[PDB]
Each structure stands twice: as C-alpha cells, then as structure tokens.
Amino acid sequence: SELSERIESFVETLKRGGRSSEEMARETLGLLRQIITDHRWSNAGELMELIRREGRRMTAAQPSETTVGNMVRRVLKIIREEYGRLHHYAQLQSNIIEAINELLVELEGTMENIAAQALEHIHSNEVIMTIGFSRTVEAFLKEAARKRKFHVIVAECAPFCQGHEMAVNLSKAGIETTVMTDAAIFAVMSRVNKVIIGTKTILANGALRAVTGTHTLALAAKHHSTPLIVCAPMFKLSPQFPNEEDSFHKFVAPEEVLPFTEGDILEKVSVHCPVFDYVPPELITLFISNIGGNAPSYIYRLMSELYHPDDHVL
Amino acid sequence: DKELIEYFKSQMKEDPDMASAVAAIRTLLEFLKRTIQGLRANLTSAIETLCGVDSSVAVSSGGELFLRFISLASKCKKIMIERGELFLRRISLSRNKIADLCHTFIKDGATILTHAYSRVVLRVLEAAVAAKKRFSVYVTESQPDLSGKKMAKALCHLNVPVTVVLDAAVGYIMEKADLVIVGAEGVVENGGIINKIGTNQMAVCAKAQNKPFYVVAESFKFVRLFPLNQQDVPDKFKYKALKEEHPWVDYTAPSLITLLFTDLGVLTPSAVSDELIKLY
Amino acid sequence: DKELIEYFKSQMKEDPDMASAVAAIRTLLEFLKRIQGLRANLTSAIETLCGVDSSVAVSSGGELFLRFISLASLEYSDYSKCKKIMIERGELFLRRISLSRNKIADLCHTFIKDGATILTHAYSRVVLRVLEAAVAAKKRFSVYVTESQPDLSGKKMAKALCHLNVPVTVVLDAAVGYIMEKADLVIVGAEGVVENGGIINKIGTNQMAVCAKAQNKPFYVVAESFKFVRLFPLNQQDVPDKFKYKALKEEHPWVDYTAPSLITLLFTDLGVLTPSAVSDELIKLYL
Numbered sequence: 113s114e115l116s117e118r119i120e121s122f123v124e125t126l127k128r129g130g131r132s133s134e135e136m137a138r139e140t141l142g143l144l145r146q147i148i149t150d151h152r153w154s155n156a157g158e159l160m161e162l163i164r165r166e167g168r169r170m171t172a173a174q175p176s177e178t179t180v181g182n183m184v185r186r187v188l189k190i191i192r193e194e195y196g197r198l199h200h201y202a203q204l205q206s207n208i209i210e211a212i213n214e215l216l217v218e219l220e221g222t223m224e225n226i227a228a229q230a231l232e233h234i235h236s237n238e239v240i241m242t243i244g245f246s247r248t249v250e251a252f253l254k255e256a257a258r259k260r261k262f263h264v265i266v267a268e269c270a271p272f273c274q275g276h277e278m279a280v281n282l283s284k285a286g287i288e289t290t291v292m293t294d295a296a297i298f299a300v301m302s303r304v305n306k307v308i309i310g311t312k313t314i315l316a317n318g319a320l321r322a323v324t325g326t327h328t329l330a331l332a333a334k335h336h337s338t339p340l341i342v343c344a345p346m347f348k349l350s351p352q353f354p355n356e357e358d359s360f361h362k363f364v365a366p367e368e369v370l371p372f373t374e375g376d377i378l379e380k381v382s383v384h385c386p387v388f389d390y391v392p393p394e395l396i397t398l399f400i401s402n403i404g405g406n407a408p409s410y411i412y413r414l415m416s417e418l419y420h421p422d423d424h425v426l
Numbered sequence: 427d428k429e430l431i432e433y434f435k436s437q438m439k440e441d442p443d444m445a446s447a448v449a450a451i452r453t454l455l456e457f458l459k460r461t462i463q464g465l466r467a468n469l470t471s472a473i474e475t476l477c478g479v480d481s482s483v484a485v486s487s488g489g490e491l492f493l494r495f496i497s498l499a500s501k502c503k504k505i506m507i508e509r510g511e512l513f514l515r516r517i518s519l520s521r522n523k524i525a526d527l528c529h530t531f532i533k534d535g536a537t538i539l540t541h542a543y544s545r546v547v548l549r550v551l552e553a554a555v556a557a558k559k560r561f562s563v564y565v566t567e568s569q570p571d572l573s574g575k576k577m578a579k580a581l582c583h584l585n586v587p588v589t590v591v592l593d594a595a596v597g598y599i600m601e602k603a604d605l606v607i608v609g610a611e612g613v614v615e616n617g618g619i620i621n622k623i624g625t626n627q628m629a630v631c632a633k634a635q636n637k638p639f640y641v642v643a644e645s646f647k648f649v650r651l652f653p654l655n656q657q658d659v660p661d662k663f664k665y666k667a668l669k670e671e672h673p674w675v676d677y678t679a680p681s682l683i684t685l686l687f688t689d690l691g692v693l694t695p696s697a698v699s700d701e702l703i704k705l706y
Numbered sequence: 707d708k709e710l711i712e713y714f715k716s717q718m719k720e721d722p723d724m725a726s727a728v729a730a731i732r733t734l735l736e737f738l739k740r741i742q743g744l745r746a747n748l749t750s751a752i753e754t755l756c757g758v759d760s761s762v763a764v765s766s767g768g769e770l771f772l773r774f775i776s777l778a779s780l781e782y783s784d785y786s787k788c789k790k791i792m793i794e795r796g797e798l799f800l801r802r803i804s805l806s807r808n809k810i811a812d813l814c815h816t817f818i819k820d821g822a823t824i825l826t827h828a829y830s831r832v833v834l835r836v837l838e839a840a841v842a843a844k845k846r847f848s849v850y851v852t853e854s855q856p857d858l859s860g861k862k863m864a865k866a867l868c869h870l871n872v873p874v875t876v877v878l879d880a881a882v883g884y885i886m887e888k889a890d891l892v893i894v895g896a897e898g899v900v901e902n903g904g905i906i907n908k909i910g911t912n913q914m915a916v917c918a919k920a921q922n923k924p925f926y927v928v929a930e931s932f933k934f935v936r937l938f939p940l941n942q943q944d945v946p947d948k949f950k951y952k953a954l955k956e957e958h959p960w961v962d963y964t965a966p967s968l969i970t971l972l973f974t975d976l977g978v979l980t981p982s983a984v985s986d987e988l989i990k991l992y993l
C-alpha cells in the first residue's frame with residue numbers, strides 16, 4: 113500500500129539520515145495519523161499494539177533521534193486518554209484524530225511561543241553565547257533582536273561546523289555576532305552574560321543530550337556561574353532516564369574529524385567523532401518551553417502529563 | 427496490646443528478608459482483624475508501641491501510611507481490610523520494580539560502592555547479575571553492627587567480586603567507584619534520605635568527585651520529616667532502642683543525591699516532594 | 707645490620723612518646739658512630755629501617771638525615787674528621803627536633819577559640835600536645851575524636867586526653883559527616899607532608915577533610931619538620947604501597963592522601979605554613 117511503503121520510507125530515511133526537528137515531529141504525526149486512519153482495528157488495544165510496534169521500529173531505526181519516539185508516546189497517551197473519557201467505540205477513530213490535529217496546531221506554534229519569551233530573558237548590551245545551529249534558538253535571538261540590541265557569540269561545533277550557518281543567519285538579522293573555534297569557550301566565558309543553547313533531547317531528569325560541545329560549554333558556564341538557558345519545545349522532551357543500558361551517543365564517520373588522506377597512520381589511530389554530549393541537569397538554569405520557562409527540577413512533572421508511565425519503554 | 431509486640435517479633439522471625447516496615451504493616455493489619463468509629467485511636471497506639479520496639483524511620487513511616495491509606499477511604503472495616511490487603515499486595519513487589527529500574531543504571535564492568543546492608547541494593551545487584559552484567563562491589567563494614575560483612579557474605583554467593591572496605595576508607599576508594607548505590611531507611615520531604623550512619627560522608631565524598639550517588643528506597647519509606655542538619659533528625663530514629671556519641675542514622679542532603687529509584691518510578695530528589703504532597 | 711633493628715625496637719620500648727622518625731634518627735646516628743661507602747651504609751640503614759616500620763615519617767625523617775649530614779660533606783671532605791663533623795652536626799639536628807612539638811603547640815594553641823569544639827582523627831602525639839598547651843593557656847573546649855579502625859587509636863587518644871580534664875567524645879568512625887557541624891575546627895597530625903602541601907595521615911583523614919571543606923570548617927594540620935616527604939601524589943593510587951600497607955576480601959590501606967586544597971593551614975616546626983608554603987620549604991630542604 114501507499115501507507116506501508118511510506119512507513120519504510122520514513123524508517124529508511126531515519127536510518128540513513130536524510131530536516132529540522134519540528135519537521136521530524138510533524139512528519140511523525142502525519143505518519144501516525146495515517147496509521148490510525150487507514151489500518152483496520154477493532155478497539156484501542158490493537159491500535160496501541162500497532163502504534164507501539166511501529167514506534168519500536170522507527171525508534172530502533174535511529175535511537176538517537178528521539179523526537180519520533182516522543183511523538184509516538186504522545187500519540188499513545190492521546191489514544192489512551194481519548195479512550196478513557198469514552199470509558200469498540202465508533203467515534204474514537206475520529207476523536208484521536210482531532211486531538212492529533214490539536215497536537216499539530218500545538219506544533220507549528222512551538223517556535224513562536226518560545227520566541228515570545230525572548231524579551232524577558234535578553235536585555236540591551238547583553239552578550240549571549242550559543243553553540244550549534246538550532247532553529248529554536250535563532251528565532252529566540254531574532255525576536256529579542258527586534259527590540260533590544262545585544263552581542264551573540266556563536267561558538268562553532270567543530271566536526272560539522274554548523275555554528276557558521278547560525279552566525280550567518282544571525283548576522284543577516286543584524287545581531288552583531290562572533291564566530292569562535294570551540295576551543296575558546298572557557299576563554300570568552302568571562303565576558304558572556306547568558307548561554308542560550310538548544311537540545312536534541314531533554315531526558316527525564318532534566319539532563320539533556322545536545323550537540324557535542326554543550327557539556328564542555330555547560331561546565332564553563334557553571335564555572336563562571338553564567339546562567340545556561342535552554343530553549344527547547346515539548347517534542348524534545350523524552351521520558352528516558354540516562355541509563356547505561358540504552359546507548360544515547362551517536363557516532364558518525366571519522367572522516368569528519370580525521371580525513372582519509374592521512375594515510376597509513378589511520379590503521380593505528382582510533383578516531384571516534386561523537387555528535388552528542390550529555391549535560392547533567394545541575395549545570396542547567398532554565399528550560400524555556402513553549403509553555404513557560406520552568407526549572408529543570410520540574411521536568412519530571414512535565415513527563416507525567418505528556419507520557420503515560422506504561423509508554424516509557426514502548 | 428502485648429501480643430502485638432511478640433507477633434511483630436515473630437514476623438521478623440519467620441522471614442528476615444521481609445522489611446521492618448512491611449512486618450509492621452502485617453502485624454498492624456492482623457491487629458486490625460480484631461467501635462470502628464475512631465479506630466484510628468486504636469491503631470495509633472499500635473504505631474506508638476511498634477515504634478517503641480523498633481527505632482527505625484520506616485516503622486514509624488510505613489505504619490503511618492497504613493494509618494492513612496485506610497483513612498483515605500473516609501461495615502467500613504471490611505473495605506478497610508480489603509484495601510489494606512491490596513496495600514500489602516502492592517508492597518511485596520516493591521524491590522522487584524526497584525531492581526528493574528536500577529540494574530539498567532549499572533554499566534558493564536562498573537565498580538559500585540555501597541553501604542552497610544540492604545535487601546534492596548542486594549536485590550538491585552541480584553537483578554544486575556541476572557541481566558548478564560559484570561561489576562565489582564565495594565561495601566563498607568559499617569560500625570558498630572558490622573553489616574557490611576553480612577552484605578558481602580550475602581553477596582559472595584552471587585559470584586561478584588566484593589571487597590569489605592574499611593569504614594574510614596570511603597574517601598580513599600571513592601575514586602575507584604563508578605557509582606554509589608545505597609538503600610535509604612527513610613526518605614524525608616526534601617528528597618534527601620535518612621540512612622545508616624556513614625551514608626552522609628559517602629555522599630559528600632561522592633559529590634566531591636562527581637560520582638553518581640543512587641538511592642534505592644521504597645514507597646513506604648517516604649516520611650514527612652524535613653531536616654535542615656543532622657540535629658533535626660529526631661532522637662527517636664538516631665539512637666536505637668571515653669564518652670560516645672554513636673547515632674545510627676544521619677541525614678543526606680538532596681543536593682548530594684543523583685537519583686532515587688523508589689517503588690513508584692525513578693525520581694529526581696526534587697521529584698520526591700510532590701510524591702509526599704500527593705499523599706499529604 | 708641486625709642489631710640496628712633491635713636498637714630501633716628498643717628506642718620504641720623505652721620511649722613511646724618519641725616519634726618513629728626520631729627513633730630512626732637515633733638508631734641511625736648510633737650506627738653512624740660505628741668516606742663515601744659510609745653513605746651507602748646509611749642508605750642500607752634507611753632501607754632496613756623503612757622495611758620494618760613502613761611509615762612515611764621513617765623513610766622521610768631518616769632521609770633528611772641522609773641529607774643533613776651530606777650537606778656538610780659538600781662543605782669539606784675527610785675520612786675521620788668528616789665523621790666527627792657528621793656526629794656534631796647530627797647531634798645538633800637531633801636536639802633541634804626534640805623541641806618540635808613544643809614549637810608546634812605554641813603556634814597552634816592560639817588558633818583554638820575559647821569554648822571551641824575541635825574534631826581530631828586517630829591519635830597524634832602532636833595534636834595531644836596542642837591540646838595540652840591549649841588547656842595550659844586556660845582555654846576550655848570540647849574534643850571529638852574518631853575511634854579510627856582497625857587499631858582503635860581514637861580510644862587510646864581519648865584515654866590519653868581524659869587526664870587533661872577535657873570533654874572528649876569517641877565518635878564512631880563512620881560519623882564524621884554527622885558531627886562535622888558540631889566542630890569548629892579540625893586538627894589532625896600528619897604522618898607525612900607531600901610536596902604539594904597535602905598530607906598523608908591514617909586512613910579516614912581524607913573524608914574528614916572533604917566533609918570539612920563541604921562545611922567550610924578550618925582543617926588544621928600539625929606536622930613536624932622531618933615529616934616533609936618528597937612525594938607528589940595526584941590521587942590515592944599515587945601513594946606508594948610501601949606506606950599504605952603495614953603488612954569477602956578485606957582491603958585495609960593504612961594511610962590516604964589529603965589534597966592541599968582541603969587543608970587550611972599547617973602548623974609545622976618551621977612556622978605556620980600555608981599549604982603552598984610547604985613546597986618552598988621542601989625545595990629548601992633539598993636545594
């Protein structure tokens with residue numbers, strides 16, 4: 113069928129890596145909406161087994177891409193809460209759809225509601241320092257740049273120099289930007305007033321898996337007591353704790369770090385190149401969500417009203 | 427009134443693996459088998475006499491939850507014993523849930539450091555070796571009851587390399603420890619724990635080297651105390667009943683604790699407080 | 707070669723209050739009384755004396771005496787005149803460290819407030835002298851002492867300190883973090899002071915210090931001049947197995963390294979020292 117082929121198309125795109133995180137969540141919702149429409153299912157139990165199986169294969173496709181797993185769990189919570197309030201229900205197939213639509217308009221407004229709180233956290237003559245290239249943080253820095261005037265230091269992330277296109281994006285909007293070399297984070301930390309970063313994933317204890325320089329960044333921010341603000345919406349909120357059994361690191365080709373033209377020493381040197389870096393929650397100051405700016409120590413509560421505890425493990 | 431104490435001692439006798447608070451709940455519920463208006467007055471005397479014979483926090487905490495897990499329902503004595511039997515059925519599965527959540531936090535080839543003796547840390551390691559993880563355990567021979575040696579004799583049967591380190595040598599072997607797993611004797615309202623004497627300096631050393639300090643408590647150990655120092659722990663709990671001080675418990679601040687693996691899911695220390703606010 | 711060990715044990719016997727390193731100095735000095743092969747004989751005496759005690763103080767206290775006499779040999783050389791300048795210089799060195807504990811007490815007893823409540827580790831003949839001089843200056847305080855397993859030296863100290871009419875409490879070895887807020891200051895006696903200014907004391911001193919800096923209690927160390935050993939540990943593994951071990955599996959190290967960031971001041975023989983200052987003195991004690 114069209115839907116099945118689109119499911120393995122999504123899974124193989126996840127495996128190979130061929131988009132932003134908000135587009136990832138939007139495509140996941142579109143896929144799961146299709147799954148609950150076009151498949152035949154009698155009651156909610158079979159559909160939860162189906163959604164669980166497909167979420168298991170999309171999660172096992174790329175386990176470090178947790179936006180798809182989060183949106184699978186959000187849809188599962190929606191299914192078991194739109195079936196709870198009706199407790200084979202005929203209108204249930206419609207009801208979940210509407211909630212999914214109410215989720216999809218909760219999305220596409222996540223970046224605006226995070227950007228609305230920019231002026232409350234960025235002041236005139238401020239110096240902000242960021243790391244990766246996250247669309248949430250650039251909209252945050254481009255909504256605060258409409259009124260106030262500040263300096264932003266975009267420390268590039270070294271293997272995939274992606275703070276380059278961030279500082280190109282920010283300098284087009286008139287923010288006076290500085291590109292760093294990622295070795296100077298402790299050097300320029302004395303000047304920096306706030307650190308605003310984005311995440312790949314917010315783990316359930318308030319810790320976060322982010323771009324590979326963010327822990328080396330957060331240690332400097334904690335050393336100089338600079339507040340580390342984290343701009344990240346509620347699809348990036350994953351209910352997984354940082355256990356050693358599950359691997360959260362992603363490792364890419366060493367050609368990003370040590371090129372293939374080095375030659376014979378590549379048979380002896382072990383080059384690694386991870387792309388994600390665990391930041392423990394005691395180095396964090398705030399999470400600017402789409403629903404506010406609450407502390408890391410509140411994140412567990414945001415788990416309980418987003419994901420059911422039976423849906424943590426799929 | 428007197429048969430209660432000997433029956434509680436019996437419930438110790440036929441199974442030592444069953445926790446002290448669970449023994450208190452069992453003898454309390456069997457006392458409830460034997461006017462029902464103001465029956466909280468009868469059971470409060472039972473709680474006071476049960477905390478008389480055992481000074482531990484869990485006996486005066488788990489028994490307090492059973493004083494109110496039956497009082498959340500407010501003849502009514504039958505629904506009381508039914509809901510209490512459900513309470514006992516759902517705390518016989520506490521250690522298994524804790525083990526299932528916590529053994530995934532031990533890396534393969536790790537080297538944990540534990541404290542005196544606890545049926546929960548022992549169960550966490552028993553589930554971790556049943557998941558084909560391999561590690562080594564450092565256990566402190568905790569003075570004065572020497573229960574570190576009891577744990578290491580109870581854990582050598584699991585074919586784990588266990589070392590009965592000195593009680594003073596925690597700061598020495600803390601750098602040879604990947605993570606610290608202790609079993610709380612009570613979890614106070616701010617998320618910190620009340621545990622066998624020496625747990626505090628295990629934590630303070632651990633945070634000095636950023637070793638994760640994991641606590642594996644249970645749901646009934648959530649007590650409503652809020653200590654601010656080691657003074658604020660009551661003398662009911664500290665003193666079990668050449669000048670010597672000799673407490674038996676001390677308070678560990680919630681900043682020193684990385685995570686609690688309680689019965690009701692993995693919690694940050696800050697996540698403990700509303701889990702006490704919900705029970706009120 | 708064997709009578710050396712017997713004489714060292716005798717100096718332990720008829721003088722228990724005398725330090726282990728001073729006993730090593732005395733027996734090695736008598737061995738000196740019995741050109742450049744004599745330096746090799748004294749080095750063999752160091753090896754045989756450290757082989758039977760294994761404290762940091764013995765292999766440091768005797769090792770300064772290998773240098774306090776060889777410094778005079780840099781000035782002049784002889785065959786028997788050098789031996790006599792060696793014995794009149796070693797006697798000066800030995801009688802200049804018989805006054806060490808009194809100098810440490812005079813410097814350190816002014817750091818105890820009236821009505822204070824100190825915390826001390828196992829048993830130090832220097833901490834005992836600091837408190838003995840502090841009660842002789844009409845200060846009154848409380849002493850918390852850890853029993854400090856395995857040899858229970860804390861009970862020996864509290865029995866040796868109850869005669870001073872001081873309220874002394876033999877706290878449990880695990881309960882440092884408990885009573886640590888009941889302590890105004892921490893006084894410990896180092897068994898050796900390493901090159902960064904940190905100390906090597908009986909096991910459990912480290913977690914006494916780590917708790918101290920956790921509550922900003924001042925952690926005072928009362929060592930002596932001959933305990934300045936030239937080691938530079940970076941962790942507890944870097945302490946040699948010579949010093950850690952005197953001999954369901956037991957581990958039992960007997961010493962552990964305390965980082966110099968945890969130490970507030972050292973009350974050595976040669977004045978009150980910042981932990982940084984120790985390093986300079988070590989350079990001066992080895993050029």
Ligand SMILES: O=P(O)(O)OC[C@H]1O[C@](O)(CO)[C@@H](O)[C@@H]1O
Binds near residue numbers: 541
């Ligand atoms: O055996 P339990 O119920 O886990 O008790 C945990 C704690 O209580 C003690 O057994 C007594 O304090 C401690 O040794 C232990 O850390």
Ligand SMILES: O=P(O)(O)OC[C@H]1O[C@](O)(CO)[C@@H](O)[C@@H]1O
Binds near residue numbers: 726829
């Ligand atoms: O003061 P003393 O007797 O020379 O030794 C000081 C330290 O060495 C020990 O006696 C043994 O390590 C410790 O008890 C003491 O802290």
